[model samples]
Target chain A: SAINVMKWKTVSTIFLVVVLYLIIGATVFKALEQPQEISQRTTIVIQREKFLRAHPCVSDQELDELIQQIVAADNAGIIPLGASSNQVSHWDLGSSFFFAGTVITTIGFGNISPRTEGGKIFCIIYALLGIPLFGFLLAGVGDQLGTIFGKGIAKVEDTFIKQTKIRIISTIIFILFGCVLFVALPAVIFKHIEGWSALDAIYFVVITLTTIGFGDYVAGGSDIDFYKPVVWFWILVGLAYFAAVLSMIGDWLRVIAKKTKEAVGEFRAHAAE
Target chain B: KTVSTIFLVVVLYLIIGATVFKALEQPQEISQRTTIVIQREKFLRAHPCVSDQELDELIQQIVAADNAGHWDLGSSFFFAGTVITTIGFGNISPRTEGGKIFCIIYALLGIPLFGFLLAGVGDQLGTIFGKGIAKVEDTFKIRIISTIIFILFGCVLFVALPAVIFKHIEGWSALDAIYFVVITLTTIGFGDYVAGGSDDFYKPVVWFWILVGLAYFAAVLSMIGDWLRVIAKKTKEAVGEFRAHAAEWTAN
Candidate 1:
């Protein structure tokens, strides 16, 4: 049947796409991650500076040996990973709660992971339930927003404006409004508060909204503790605005996908004719 | 709506989540820093770059310790990844407050947006899974047994095999390797445990793993959703029939 053929075609296409995507991603990432070899001399000097501060100049053999020791310690994770293994109670309530939040949300920031076996096991179970809950929330909010938007747009159709013109205008507005609110404006504010440059603020917004939470520049990092409240305050608002923008795009894609499929069908039929 | 209920729950998690993370992670981070500083100072004192002296008998322990890179097309490619997989593994996180704020916005918008792309592929996944279910039923003569088999196939192929590969590459324990696969596939990407330590191939390997894992998840969820939708329709049909029966009895 035509339906069977179409289904097979789609299934095959999607499968291929998945494969291609993975293969390409791997190849490209590998190329980009090409390591620049660190000269042994520089490495030795760095360790030397710190070690030398304490003891007198030692034999060249000692220098080599010390460097080897440094390597050994580093190999064992004895040295650093952005910092040492923070031994603050693994289950610090607030942090655990946050950890739990990130886990379920799948934002495993890795800055502080659940080190315990129980924690690891529990994290697995928690995600199984949590992700579904998140999905439900996303779709539900989307539904409610859809209702609100549908009514507003329906009213404006004949009485206020044409769909295309309004849509075009709104599309531009979303980007414009989003840039100013989420990026440009926040950049200025964060730069001042965090004592970061405007560009750093810009990078921060791009990174966080995407949920990297690298811990490189957490909102209120050390030395500059003032931005804590300010960052705390805007997070939810930022999430909401972002949600709105994304949901709209989701809505946009559904239409395009359906139309494209139909277009493909027609084009194929025409070719056959 | 049911979605609304879930929404409230997720929000609750976030609110409660931050506090716990703060309570635990912040203090621990502080302490860890303190320990490392002391350790580094001791090492610095003991090891200063000498022309040469017998390194020392207790070189490994008494010495002390320390550690640490960044982002750019390679970085952009890296960033593009953080968007879809939601892996933002903090290799480079926001340094400024503005970025944090913006990051929140971008993620909320971006994750769902890319999710649709996944869903697009999932559409075909449903058809393929349905076929699997049918094929399984042909052999097992069970209703959903085929679907069960289908799921098993996916798990073994995607999850178990990948776990083994991760174990070798990352030098993680068996459980850790499995956890990495699960965590990565789920997009929780706790930066604490990423593979490809210093290899140039790390990017591609990481990228490949992410995409493969994502595809499996997409297929599994899509198929399950297809089943649930069917179940829901049947449930409504049953309810309608029961309601009609009551109406007939009242009339009689």
Candidate 2:
């Protein structure tokens, strides 16, 4: 009974969160966007008579067509300061690679995307598979890294010397080194190449590394472009690096969970007594 | 045992893709630059001395490296994909200031929703997969050999067929296609190459196949994982017994 309820509870929790997120995003965007619209947009309708007096050559029909184009541009993302309406560029190789990498890695920054109905549907489907696929891969890599990490921890635990101290120190050092190699180094590289502020780059890597996927910041001008071997190189290698860290974190959480379960079991046993 | 073999193969590819793409991909990038150089030269000839700073700026505007085109349904959905998966490729980013603000806020909700959906889909698929294995178990020994058979079947369906299709249609080499599949399935999304960019009407059908393929990929891996876990347990006990016997003999 408890287990079944847990399942339902989990599902209900997920749905509730999803609904809240959708509402928050929609509401926030409107509150923010509409304010700009009111301040910045001088409805071309009001400017029509003024335009005719200024430009005697322009007829009312031509002005009407001009206003329509301007309005259309405002609504579409084709012009500056608009939403992307068919903005998936076919030619930008760097962008495509960046896209491919992001989608697979699940870092989807939400910058470049398709504009068609099918594209959207397929995107949802693509994600369904990609997340778990990468998730297990991260787990698998973590498991592999654990083999080496376990060996070191086991060695120190062989005892007689500063065992606990050494274990703690070693873990601290190892993680510090790994972060430098995996996160900080890459962050700096991002700062230099993508022309991001140091803070932005580090922020980018942390969000991406944690796999919350950088959310709103996903749409930024960090173009470490094209056949840019180093960026791509970093991505592939960085993924493994990220996976290893994920593994470390996952292992940490699992250990905590396992310990709590034992304590709960002990409490239940005590109750029976 | 066979599952470990499968896992080892993926790790090997992870290493290779990282190592190889670093070299292979940069050449194309160089060529693109070479064209930029040509464009620079042509521009100079056409205009008789442009400033390097101005030229580079001119080139950038002409190039518009971000290339985020359609910003509607597909864009939003794909961004949703990126959010749920957490790939966050920094290309074609949010332009409108409002979008930028919420993309972050919305992502928190998306990550879990995507995860819930994945768990839900995986559960459904697992039920069907279990039935298939149950049918097989009745007829055969169902251990290493079954693992081998399943790996082959999974590989062919998820990797081989799609590999061929993307190779021809998406214009990727075979290795690239396979690499793309592995990288995507891994969900770290290196964002260097991608799928589902086809203009043809068949995009959704292909997308359906890839999704099913991913689901199938997850399904097989879970089963294989269960099998290996059992094998590991038995072997660990066997080894522990041997160690105990050796210790007692030494004491005696």
Candidate 3:
């Protein structure tokens, strides 16, 4: 049937696009990141040479071995050699709460992960129960927002001139309003509070709401005291908004798929006749 | 009321989790720091020419260098995977402006495309699974029981069994391996415990596990959601019945 053919075509196309997207991402990322990496490597080599000149007693291999050890420790979330000895524990009370929030939200920023065996085990158990609970909450809030937004859209659509533009117009309206409320303005607030650059704040907000949560630019991470949970609340609402937006895009795709399927069916029928 | 209850439960869970984790990890963190300090002190003593200030400066430079070198093909591919999966490990995130802008655009489209791909694959897997179990299902009428087994088996296969392999391969503790498995599969992907860090031969295994485990968990969670709603409805009815019974007793 034409339907089967169309289904396969759609699947293959999506598959192709994704593969291509990945390749492009890989290429672009490598292009952008490798030069900085080389520069950093050069800088390190120069520093090592300078250190060797200062200390003739320590061999090059000895210094390299020390570096290897410290880097290993660093990877395991320990910083052995720093000037500031007054290091905040990653597992401090507020930090742990923030970590817990990330876990339930499935945003898992690894900057401060559970280190011990017991902690790892507890994490598994915690996530098992917490994910569903948070999932339920996000869904409930998302549904509420959807209903509110839908009613407002309905009012606008009721006075519209054509059915063709309804979905397109409504989507634009939904996205623009949501971005202003959740994305743009919150980014500004984050900029002020988190001491991030404008771009950094915007990027953090997007990364967070999408739950991609790279942890590279986490908000409320400054040394000072601010209620970190407030950012968590923002994340909760922002995540729901993003999910709603993603599903809205999904709906648009579904509509397009249906239309294409029908067109294929009609074309095949006419060809048969 | 349901939202509020869930919200409160989440808050309570966070508090308990925070307290528990702080207790579990803080001492370990301090001990680790102490070990590092001892090691540093010994190194300084052995190399008496190496001053503390110079060493600290050198260490900072080395750390900066270590953070900068992850733009190779395997790492970039991993980054791309993390991006579209929304895992976003942030271990090797785009540091450059162009990369960041590209990342946002890539994610904007890739997420939906990946979502569609997963759904299609999940649908096909469900069909294959249904057919595979058809005979047993027909004979026993054990759909519910079978589904419970399915989840258990998936956990063992995807979560428990592979963790053993990861433990050996990554030289992580058994608990850490399982923790990584659950974290990755759930798409939480805390960058603390990534697989195939030492070797790329097993990287493909991590990729496959992520793909299959995501579909498995999605189905599992969706089923749990459905079951919870059914249970919630039943409880609501039972509560209503008990309330009416109490009212009748009061009238009597």
Q: lDDT: which candidate is best? A: 3
Give the Cα lDDT of each candidate.
0.57, 0.53, 0.80
* DockQ of predictions, in order shown: 0.24, 0.09, 0.65
Worst 10-residue lDDT window for candidate 1 chain B reads B63-72
- TM-score of every prediction relative to native: 0.62, 0.47, 0.88
The 10-residue segment of model 2 chain A with minimum total lDDT is A76-85
Which runs of model 2 end up more than 4 angstroms from their true locations? A1-206, A212-273, B1-55, B63-69, B89-91, B96-98, B160-179, B195-214, B218-252
Q: Pick the candidate with the highest TM-score.
A: 3
Residue A245 lDDT (model 1): 68
Ranking 1 against 2 by lDDT, winner: 1
DockQ of 1: 0.24
Calculate candidate 3's fnat: 0.75
lDDT of each residue in B74-147, candidate 1, tens digit only: 55355546655677665544333443444555455446655655555556556667776777566663656665
Q: Once model 1 is optimally superposed onto the true structure by TM-score, how far is the C-alpha of residue A272 displaced, in angstroms?
A: 26
Residue ranges of candidate 3 with Cα displaced over 4 Å: A1-13, A59-61, A75-84, A154-163, A225-227, A251-273, B198-201, B227-252
For model 1, what is the alpha-carbon lDDT of residue A162? 23
By DockQ, the better pick of 1 and 3 is: 3
Candidate 2: DockQ? 0.09
* Chain B fold agreement for model 1, TM-score: 0.55
Q: TM-score of A-chain in each prediction?
A: 0.57, 0.53, 0.81
